Design an enzyme around this catalytic site. Structure first.
Site: not given
Ligand code: ZN
Ligand code: CA
Ligand code: CA
Ligand code: CA
Ligand code: ZN
Lengths: 160, 173
Positions: A114, A118, A124
């Protein structure tokens, strides 16, 4: 502003380690988290052991040298920064959590994939199945872990 | 930003402030702090009084910045945030939900009941099975076994309250 890395070949460094799990495990989960994205994009990653790399991976508790201090065990697990120079692209893991090789507790590989997402310039997702979903979603077995199509389309709209 | 959202009782206890408020206007960003702030009109205050017109939150989504997604300007939200330097701070992880969307039991919890289990009880998040229980004062929050999140029977109707001195079990509201 559409932030993304202006370079295909990126470097990464694991600055510190957590006492929760062996150093080999931390490395394995990080390189697997980077592989998840290497297999979909033209991106390639090289590991540094000194100096400052593009993506600097750290474990930290509470205040730890940026504007967003972690919140002890529970609530937030980790954050990262959008691509760019300096702190941009870095990933911070709250070490007040108990990090695991397997799928009990909080899997280091899930959260790393995850945050790397980013670090690469993704936001998101609203799809709960997507890896860029903000809430931690633990899987019954990592064997059949698949990158969502929302995630592929986002990262490919950034990098091709 | 990866998050394990707290139970509403856990959120009532870790939060310095719990209020009903209306979000008014877009956020304003101060690049010195790296935080943005939303103007709010507070309606009611269920937890606080030791310290409102602004709420602050991180500026980017990846560092757990709360981004208001509501377009209805008259909508009341329940905000449970922490007080840093006399300022109200929330994150993507703070318990912030429309007041009307909360179950009647959650409204009772914020208003009266959640505080009864605050001093001694503890909602323990179960992220996987087998889940380990640590003490008789922890209630294992197993709604993670479903789709997840605050939509769950234990979140919407149950609170971690004491039955005996030294023993807290889930109870109904
Ligand atoms: Zn995040
Ligand atoms: Ca935490
Ligand atoms: Ca960096
Ligand atoms: Ca730890
Ligand atoms: Zn940080």
């Amino acid at each position: 502003g559409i932030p993304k890395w202006r370079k295909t070949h990126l470097t990464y460094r694991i600055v510190n380690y957590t006492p929760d799990l062996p150093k080999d495990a931390v490395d394995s989960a990080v390189e697997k988290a980077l592989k998840v994205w290497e297999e979909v994009t033209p991106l390639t990653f090289s590991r540094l052991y000194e100096g400052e790399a593009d993506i600097m991976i750290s474990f930290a508790v509470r205040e730890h040298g940026d504007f967003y201090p972690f919140d002890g065990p529970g609530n937030v697990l980790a954050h990262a920064y959008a691509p760019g120079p300096g702190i941009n692209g870095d990933a911070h893991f709250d070490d007040d959590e108990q990090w695991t090789k397997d799928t009990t507790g909080t899997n280091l590989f899930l959260v790393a994939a995850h945050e790397i997402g980013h670090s690469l310039g993704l936001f998101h997702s609203a799809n709960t199945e997507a890896l860029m979903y903000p809430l931690y979603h633990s899987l019954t077995d990592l064997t059949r872990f698949r990158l969502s199509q929302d995630d592929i389309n986002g990262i490919q709209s950034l990098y091709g | 930003c990866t998050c394990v959202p707290p139970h509403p009782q856990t959120a009532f206890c870790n939060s310095d402030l719990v209020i009903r408020a209306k979000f008014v206007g877009t956020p304003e960003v101060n690049q010195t702090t790296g935080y943005q702030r939303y103007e709010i009109k507070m309606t009611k205050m269920y937890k606080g009084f030791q310290a409102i017109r602004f709420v602050y939150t991180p500026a980017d989504e990846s560092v757990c910045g709360y981004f208001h997604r509501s377009h209805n300007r008259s909508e009341e939200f329940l905000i449970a945030g922490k007080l840093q330097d006399g300022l109200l701070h929330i994150t993507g992880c703070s318990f912030v939900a429309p007041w009307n969307s909360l179950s009647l039991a959650q409204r009772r919890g914020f208003t009266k009941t959640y505080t009864v289990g605050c001093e001694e009880c503890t909602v323990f998040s179960c992220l996987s099975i087998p889940c380990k229980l640590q003490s008789g004062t922890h209630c294992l929050w197993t709604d993670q076994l479903l789709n997840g999140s605050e939509k769950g029977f234990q979140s919407r109707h149950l609170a971690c309250l004491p039955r005996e001195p030294g023993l807290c079990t889930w109870q109904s509201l």
